[model samples]
Target: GICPRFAHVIENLLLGTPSSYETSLKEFEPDDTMKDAGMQMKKVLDSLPQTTRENIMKLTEKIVKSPLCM
Candidate 1:
């Protein structure tokens, strides 16, 4: 699931979904809109089980051996 999940989550949406202004507004105001987005992101993060996280890491190692530029 690693490749497929990454393909869907990263290739498909990660770069397209958020913007600098939107992120700045979120950090500055954090009104209902930000709260709502945070809640939704929290739900997704919370739902991923530890098993998936570990397995995904294993799969990632197969594709990448060295640390990347951060």
Candidate 2:
């Protein structure tokens, strides 16, 4: 279950999918899309179990600690 579960999280997506932008003819809006992304992420980590969160976060930390800053 570790492999399946660890690979199945929005955090995994966030950890990898970090990205974006847009504009409307309406000329407008002001909302935090980044935070919106993080908010959705909160939903993922905030669910019933954090066991996966721990596992996933280890991967997340690795990315954070040493990213491909090229």
Candidate 3:
């Protein structure tokens, strides 16, 4: 399986599925780029409305803490 960690980061921000997660999974790359992208995701999430921010934050937390991502 592709890294849902990176996909989830993109997923939560989009707030809707695009390409049914297929394109993203195929494009997945496990490298320092994802770490950088995750950081960027945080910045974008921080700029969202409070409630939405918190919700996505929780999602991010779950993905980040998962063994699958590591």
What is candidate 3's lDDT per residue for 1-70, written digit by digit as tens? 3465675645645553334333454455646777466556556655667678567756866876789867
TM-score of each: 0.32, 0.34, 0.32
Ranking by TM-score: 2, 3, 1
Alpha-carbon lDDT of model 3:
0.57
Q: In candidate 1, which residue ranges exceed 4 Å CA deviation?
A: 1-29, 54-70
Model 3 TM-score on a 0 to 1 scale: 0.32
The runs of at least 3 residues in candidate 2 whose Cα sits more than 4 Å from the true structure, single-residue gaps closed, are 1-31, 62-70
Instruction: Give the number of the best model, judged by TM-score.
Output: 2
Stretches of candidate 3 off by over 4 Å are 1-30, 55-70
Give a tens-digit lDDT track for model 1, residues 1-70.
2444444343212222334324533444678976577557645644667676556655655555445511
Q: Residue 22's C-alpha lDDT in candidate 3?
A: 34
Could you tell me which 10 consecutive residues in candidate 1 have the lowest summed lDDT? 11-20
When summed lDDT is taken over every stretch of 10 residues in candidate 3, the lowest stretch is 16-25
lDDT of 2 by residue, 1-70 (tens): 2333333433444333323122221123436875576557555645635566567777765664564622
Question: lDDT of each model, Cα atoms only?
Answer: 0.47, 0.46, 0.57
Q: Please state the error at residue 50 of candidate 1 in Å.
A: 1.5
Clashing pairs in 1: none
